[PDB]
Write an enzyme that holds these catalytic residues in place. Structure first.
Site, PDB file in Angstrom:
ATOM      1  CG  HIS A 168      60.700  67.034  33.746  1.00  0.00           C
ATOM      2  ND1 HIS A 168      61.320  67.623  32.416  1.00  0.00           N
ATOM      3  CD2 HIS A 168      60.006  67.119  34.047  1.00  0.00           C
ATOM      4  CE1 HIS A 168      61.057  68.290  33.103  1.00  0.00           C
ATOM      5  NE2 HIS A 168      59.767  69.023  34.210  1.00  0.00           N
TER       6      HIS A 168
ATOM      7  CB  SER B 120      60.527  71.539  35.667  1.00  0.00           C
ATOM      8  OG  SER B 120      61.233  70.610  35.518  1.00  0.00           O
TER       9      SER B 120
ATOM     10  CG  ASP C 154      62.242  68.006  29.718  1.00  0.00           C
ATOM     11  OD1 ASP C 154      62.829  67.986  30.506  1.00  0.00           O
ATOM     12  OD2 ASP C 154      60.631  67.883  29.645  1.00  0.00           O
TER      13      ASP C 154
END
Ligand SMILES: CCOc1cccc(-c2nnc(N)s2)c1
Ligand SMILES: *[C@@H]1O[C@H](CO)[C@@H](O)[C@H](O)[C@H]1NC(C)=O
EC number: 3.1.1.98
Length: 341
Positions: free
Chosen positions: A287, A145, A242
């Protein structure tokens, strides 16, 4: 379990001035080192950083950190959970700078918060050299991330840092998980990143900064723009749909307009990876993946992520039956049967 060490240089701090740090599990019989950058969004002015400090304080301070953490996924030491690098020296670097790992600004009489992400990485590397990193053959800087974007922003600076310190033989590489975003039209953050860079005194890689120049450094936070400027090998992991990308795009019985929007997002992401030789991009709505315990389950064209990473290792010594570029072609979330449930 990885054990916490707070940085000996106490001028390198989290947002609130408390010391930054790292969690470490050594492997005496290995010359491979994995340094993982945690993620968790960011904050870009006084008011939204104050809100973050109330209810996300472990991402802004070390005061309440636990003294150990369990290694999971690519940070696991069990071969059954981590077929790729189970015998490596493992490092988990907590994200406590709220700056996508780009900042270089201390707390002071004019700054309520410190934003030192870029300096935290440099100081972790320096202090690890005295704990065995001086004998490494490969240093893999990985992240998920905001930590995946941080890999893209910092991998070449780590390589330069080790060269200038007299370790030209350590091979520095990057692994960016879920940090490859598009500055696309919304269905219903370029500005938030532009403001953040000024608030954080953010720094970006030199070649990318020279291309885009003053006032436009926000461009270098977008993978498809910064990746061509990098010299270190970087492996890119990115879900085609995503969830953080869709959240920012204001996407939440799908009618034609949203159907076309979602298919065009997948197509555009696939296009930006066409000339990335080390990449893994499944057609799933999800994610992050690399520190998930079930990261071994997903496959693209019959090849798992730990296998693709091992094939990447071999390529850095095309390989028969050992691919490194794996991008799905099917156009809707979960058209891949192996997607996370
Ligand atoms: C470091 C970049 O972080 C992100 C993450 C997710 C989405 C976006 C954006 N989406 N649409 C835009 N116009 S910018 C940016
Ligand atoms: C401590 O960190 C600061 C911030 O990066 C740096 O300027 C300074 O040189 C460091 N001191 C030592 C002794 O490493």
């Amino acid at each position: 379990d990885l054990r916490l060490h707070l940085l000996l240089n106490t001028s390198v701090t989290c947002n609130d001035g408390s010391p930054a740090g790292y969690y470490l599990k050594e492997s005496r019989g290995s010359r491979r080192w994995l340094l993982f950058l945690e993620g968790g969004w960011y904050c870009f002015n006084r008011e939204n950083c104050d809100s973050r400090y109330d209810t996300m304080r472990r991402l802004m301070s070390s005061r309440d950190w636990p003294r150990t953490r369990t290694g999971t996924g690519i940070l696991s030491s069990q071969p059954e959970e981590n077929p790729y690098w189970w015998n490596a020296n493992m490092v988990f670097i907590p994200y406590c700078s709220s700056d996508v790992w780009s900042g270089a600004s201390s707390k002071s009489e004019k700054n309520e918060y410190a934003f030192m992400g870029a300096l935290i990485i440099q100081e972790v590397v320096r202090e690890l050299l005295g704990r065995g990193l001086s004998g490494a053959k490969v240093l893999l800087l990985a992240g998920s991330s905001a930590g995946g974007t941080g890999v893209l922003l910092n991998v070449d600076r780590v390589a330069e840092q080790l060269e200038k310190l007299g370790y030209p033989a350590i091979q520095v590489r990057g692994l960016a998980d879920s940090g490859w975003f598009l500055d696309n039209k919304q269905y219903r953050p370029t500005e938030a990143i532009r403001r953040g860079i000024r608030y954080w005194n953010g720094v970006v890689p030199e070649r990318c900064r020279r291309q885009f120049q003053e006032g436009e450094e926000w461009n270098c936070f977008f993978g498809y723009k910064v990746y061509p400027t990098l010299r270190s090998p970087v492996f890119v992991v990115q879900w085609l749909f995503d969830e953080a990308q869709l959240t920012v795009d204001n996407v939440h019985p799908v009618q034609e307009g949203l159907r076309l929007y979602i298919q065009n997002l997948g197509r555009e992401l696939r296009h930006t990876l066409k000339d990335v030789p080390a990449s893994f991009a499944p057609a799933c709505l999800s994610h992050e993946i690399i520190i998930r315990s079930h990261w071994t389950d997903v496959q693209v064209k019959g090849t798992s992520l730990p296998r693709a990473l091992h094939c990447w290792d071999r390529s850095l010594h095309p390989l028969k039956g050992c691919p490194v570029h794996l991008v799905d072609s099917c156009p809707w979330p979960h058209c891949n049967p192996s997607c996370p449930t």
